[PDB]
Symmetry: C3
Subunit: 119 residues, 3 copies
Amino acid sequence: AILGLGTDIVEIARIEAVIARSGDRLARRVLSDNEWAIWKTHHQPVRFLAKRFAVKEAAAKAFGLAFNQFEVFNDELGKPRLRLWGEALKLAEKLGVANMHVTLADERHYACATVIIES
Amino acid sequence: AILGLGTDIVEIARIEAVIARSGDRLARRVLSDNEWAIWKTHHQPVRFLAKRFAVKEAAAKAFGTLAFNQFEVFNDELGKPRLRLWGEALKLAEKLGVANMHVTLADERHYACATVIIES
Amino acid sequence: AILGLGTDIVEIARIEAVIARSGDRLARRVLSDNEWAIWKTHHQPVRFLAKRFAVKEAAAKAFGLAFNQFEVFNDELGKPRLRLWGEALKLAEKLGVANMHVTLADERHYACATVIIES
Ligand SMILES: [Cl-]
Ligand SMILES: [Cl-]
Ligand SMILES: [Cl-]
């Protein structure tokens, strides 16, 4: 059964503006340790962050819990996946979450994501 | 089992332009009585209407099109967006055996989007 | 259970730009025979292709292949459905896909689509 559903859309220019004003602050707040390491060497880190933000916001909505607790990674097939930390992980176990489905897309100006959590 | 799936994207400026040209007409057709009352006094009414359009269009698609005013959006006691169905849409959900409706929406400066899944 | 989830957003002006470069060659690539026939006489071929593109990319993400293997058609009622060919059809049979849920939307500047495949 579906236990939760979330979506988000992110204007990439909005994230760019935050970075211009705050520097690394946003990424340090919302990225897990593994994601931070990617951020540091990424060729397009603003785009990377905006896409991560979209997924994390979609995940947070699906679960109804800081953004750095919703880690996005790509599995052995190259498919985007969620790995939970801390309170988010405890909530997942509490809710009886068995599967988590993640998708994201980006165009030049916008990134989008949808997350479904399932028993 | 999933019984239906719908999505929509709404350019807020389009809603703004229609309201500028014909005022209340757009809102009157698609809003329930409760939603109309909110529309009339909302601090950001164009954004309110745009976001309502995204959810209603997504819902209508999920139900496999139904009048938008029969897909009432409300926030529950925890503040989460939910559907309240009326008339033909309510009877349809009963006939389809809908047990669960899942609604999500998002908005940026220029666009709102929404996805609805209905489930047995 | 949900077997896969995909989403896409397509900037229509980008598709228009691709068509300016290579004419009908993109359509030749991503469209099945049935879609190609519709393309030839469409009133708005750019929009048609952009919308097809969004659905096809979302479907490919849901399955985790080629775009011409994910045919979009309208059923007797008028709602979008997927018809699979070649490798896509074989993969669906392997995964035991029972239902394929498709939705799409378009604004002036963007098309979007979400696909859910189910057991
Ligand atoms: Cl407004
Ligand atoms: Cl209507
Ligand atoms: Cl066109």
